């Protein structure tokens with residue numbers, strides 16, 4: 001659809017949007033094009049805050065000048081966009097601002113997606129009221145596998161939706177995020193944005209077809225929030241930088257098995273199935289388990305029910321399901337006394353009961 005961005009905020013106000021990251025428990029890759037277009041995808045994932053905060057944040061502000069100012073705190077970068085030719089220049093070399101550019105474009109600041117036709121960006125945001133100033137914060141080393149890219153895209157889209165009064169619900173935010181992924185030619189799946197924007201634990205399912213709008217079924221969060229099991233979920237930043245159809249059918253069926261185990265509240269089965277998801281991911285691709293990750297895994301595999309890397313991974317973050325709190329203390333001991341990198345450390349993850357949230361000052 002075409003959008004009509006209208007300044008829905010006061011001139012002395014800032015829109016703050018923020019989203020947790022996402023850990024996929026099972027079914028990942030079945031959401032990734034093109035296999036999702038044949039059998040459909042089943043993905044059990046979950047929204048998590050890191051160290052008690054939503055990691056993916058966006059500030060949107062009115063700007064005195066009649067242009068667009070993109071800033072990045074985690075990279076300390078800045079860029080000025082004043083024409084449609086610059087805004088739609090998504091892969092400007094050296095610009096880490098492809099995501100907010102595409103998001104502003106989808107919000108009606110590009111000629112194709114704006115319902116009202118304008119001639120220049122200056123006139124467009126002069127009728128809009130003033131310029132726009134977007135400041136991003138993604139305090140996560142890239143290549144984490146935590147859905148950072150797509151969830152940050154959804155966060156920018158929701159911040160702009162609140163900033164312009166577009167009245168998008170979370171589902172349409174995720175759908176426009178899929179459109180944005182198609183704009184930047186990332187070819188990415190749809191698991192990440194639904195895992196991050198929507199609160200709690202979810203099973204996501206699609207049918208065959210090019211239209212990939214996932215059906216969402218929430219799961220109880222007992223195995224993640226109850227004090228019996230809460231301290232058994234460990235997330236470890238490792239300091240690492242970065243015929244098949246039968247296997248993907250097996251991955252769909254395994255996502256359904258994980259859904260069953262979570263419904264029934266079986267913690268041991270849940271951990272074993274996380275381990276099986278790790279085995280499936282290793283079977284699918286060669287570069288899933290770099291040698292440093294396996295070196296870490298060998299130190300603590302005897303105290304876990306299962307483990308995996310979030311998303312594509314390739315290193316960085318490692319999710320582990322300890323057998324019990326005593327085993328969790330043992331794992332923290334081992335990985336603190338045998339750090340595979342000086343930057344390796346544990347990250348406290350909590351289930352997000354909020355998902356994407358947005359407020360004003």
Ligand SMILES: C[C@@H]1O[C@H](OP(=O)(O)O)[C@@H](O)[C@H](O)[C@@H]1O
Nearest residue numbers: 028029145146147189311312313
């Ligand atoms: C298993 C794979 O994980 C990716 O997540 P990231 O590693 O990019 O955070 C998703 O973008 C893919 O769609 C796929 O589900």
